[PDB]
Amino acid sequence: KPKLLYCSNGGHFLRILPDGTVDGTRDRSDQHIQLQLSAESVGEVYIKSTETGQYLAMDTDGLLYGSQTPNEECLFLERLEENGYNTYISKKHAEKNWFVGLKKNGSCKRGPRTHYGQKAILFLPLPVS
């Protein structure tokens, strides 16, 4: 049911740390990379941490974070791209085209700094098992 969100940019797996922070990691054994995606409406998804129960979210600053409670900031519009990768846009900031993204160093690429045509936004869901 859960998957790993592999960031093509730097090859990191999306990670939601116990401290509420979100970043990228190359460590396949990391306990914080197993995410369960759940669709609310069609094309709409929640990305929860199986380890902590936290929901992936995007703040008004465009920074990703681990949310203890699902919420409006927790919704993402998933998009299956032509090149084979998926994309996730902040539903709450769609109009601005704010994506989920990771820098080559595995750090979060703020929503505002994101842009289509970027690698940082390309993700690949992979089986955990």
Burial of 113 (0-12, 13-18, 19+ CB in 10 A): middle
9 known member of a binding site = yes
Cα 9 from Cα 4, distance rounded (Å): 15
What is the stated resolution of the deposited model, in angstroms? Answer: 2.0
Structural domain that includes position 4: 1-129
What separation in angstroms does the CA of 11 have from each of 25, 42, 43, 55, 124?
8, 28, 24, 22, 10
Cα 80 from Cα 95, distance rounded (Å): 18
Domain harbouring 45, CATH code: 2.80.10.50
Domain count, the chain: 1
